[PDB]
Amino acid sequence: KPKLLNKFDKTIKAELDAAEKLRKRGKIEEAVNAFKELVRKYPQSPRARYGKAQCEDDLAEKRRSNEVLRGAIETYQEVASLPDVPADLLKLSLKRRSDRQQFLGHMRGSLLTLQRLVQLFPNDTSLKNDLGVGYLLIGDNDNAKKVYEEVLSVTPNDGFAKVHYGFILKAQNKIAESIPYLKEGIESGDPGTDDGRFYFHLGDAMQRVGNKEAYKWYELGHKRGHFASVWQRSLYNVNGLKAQPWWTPKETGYTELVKSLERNWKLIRDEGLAVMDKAKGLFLPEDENLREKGDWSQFTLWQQGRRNENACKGAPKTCTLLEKFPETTGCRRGQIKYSIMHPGTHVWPHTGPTNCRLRMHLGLVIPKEGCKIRCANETKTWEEGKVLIFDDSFEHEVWQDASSFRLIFIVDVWHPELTPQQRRSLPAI
Template sequence: MTHPAPRRSQDVRTRYTELINALQAEGDHDAARRCAALAVEQGVWRHPAQRPVHYLPSIPPRPVYDPSAFWFTAHLQENHAAIRAELDAVTDPAGQGFLPVEEPLLGKGRWEQVTFYEAGHRFDDACARFPVTAAVIEGIPEAAHAGSGVATLSWLYPGTHIVPHCGGTNARLRVHLGLKVPEGPVMRVGEEWLHWEEGRCLVFDDSFEHEVRHEGTEPRVVLLLDVTHPALDEHTRDAILADRASFEERVVGFMRRQGIGRVEIDDDAVRLFADRSTASLIHRHLREVGASAVELRDGRLCYDEKILHT
């Protein structure tokens, strides 16, 4: 069955994405699949498992690629031993700049990463901690300065589940170089189940629904890189890179969306202060319920030591 070329706006894609994600979060995966199929029928996407908000319909929907088709996979694999030697010196991930990934993608378990690049922005501290790895990344321009995604070391602990999700754009591909690969971790991309191998690369389109499960006993570590999709024409690629927001602009946008007016870091502690509008809202609510403090736990508001269902 052939589907019509996508013709819907980004706003429509965003709303379908939110609905599908909400259905999955509630555990109604059948309804989520039916909704994704309806979206394809309505010309939102071309494949029900590929649901990015930023979508280029000219790129064929293909979930997994042959690593040997890309020059940089040989570059990464040739440098595997040097990267692994640098990684083997890490006995305390937190002390070496690995930070927890705490977001809706983490269904359970523990997931940490150290980021070298994000949307072309170089994180000097990470590169100084891992100079060998940073040098290898910088030898791949489409993943470093000219990249639109991230370059990280991803440390996944046993018992972790990264829930099914779709990346935000199909304008790039994701590359994994296996560094520490014990028995147990597996990744699904679309309908394909992939296994990592130490010293070998995987290449896939993360705009397809994918998830990771680690049922082993030792951490899995990969070098993760986003690279520009080779199917992009030069004009589209340049337009995407020109539209990249600076890191400062992204932080400003995040703080505005979250109602944060100020952030302070004291050692490992992070303190967030609400902006004026958000602070006023919370203050009014606490006054109404007669409480002096509130905390969000498992989707419920907790006032002092009393849990109120809202």
């Protein structure tokens, strides 16, 4: 049902369909040559240059090389400079250009294309919404906000605009205000609203205002295929891995690592405390977004399977000890770090980025009261010299209401059911 032919193109249809059918066939290099060999025959053929662009685009995905895709991007541009272009074609051409620009990471370039599209089609609400995304991708939330306010002023019930507007409000720390927009947008069922990210932000927003209803939406998100479960909501996952919030050492199979940590715990403690005393600067503040209040800092020895040399100079014995255990030092999706938390601290409920790791906590300095950690429905406490093990892809939450500082040692390990080849293959997080 789209009109892709000006007065010109209608005359040469039998040829255009030929070159097109070639592409549909998958015999690409020819459709290219075909399409290439039609502009010289007739330069002012939008449907010809557009065709060429598609081939280049199609070819980009086959060759999987960004240089050819860059070619397509300009060819799409060329379509829009021709004398008489069908509205549908012009729109298709530039929209696709913008999308590919975003794919390459040319965010401001995509934005410029979207700005052009919006002035070319002032009445297309779909394109205004896309422009808003353009602004978001360069971090210009203020202009994005203006865009979605325009849309909503004309189309009060556009779901796409609502979830994005809600997102923007939440990013501006207007948490409570963001929730109705996120809800209504998702409930609209409009194209682009069935996105895990909006379930994430909606749930997060509700939890930060104490609305227990958040779990209803996490459950819905799970049923929509956005989360592994109501509790397990990590983004980068491997299917088939045993999924439970709390693990015993025996269940993990990493009994020797655990034994080594527990048996040498005073040593691990003392080197961490020595850094605190003599080089407190190496303890960096933890994720500000996860901290409601209080004081919370970390000192990393390993990150994504990479040893931090300067840090291991501060805790040489501890690093020497860990070298023996590649299941953690080689875990490219985990870390090894000291974590200190002071009284009056609360960490928002949250989830890790992957189900490919388990997280061990060795207690080093644990006040007799006030410190606890919940993972899923079970809350537990640390013990000095003892290891806790949980799957941090499950929602967990932390409190520190003691009268003195709490120090733990965090050791990530590969999920034990991951194969050697999997461990070798997975990219880092």
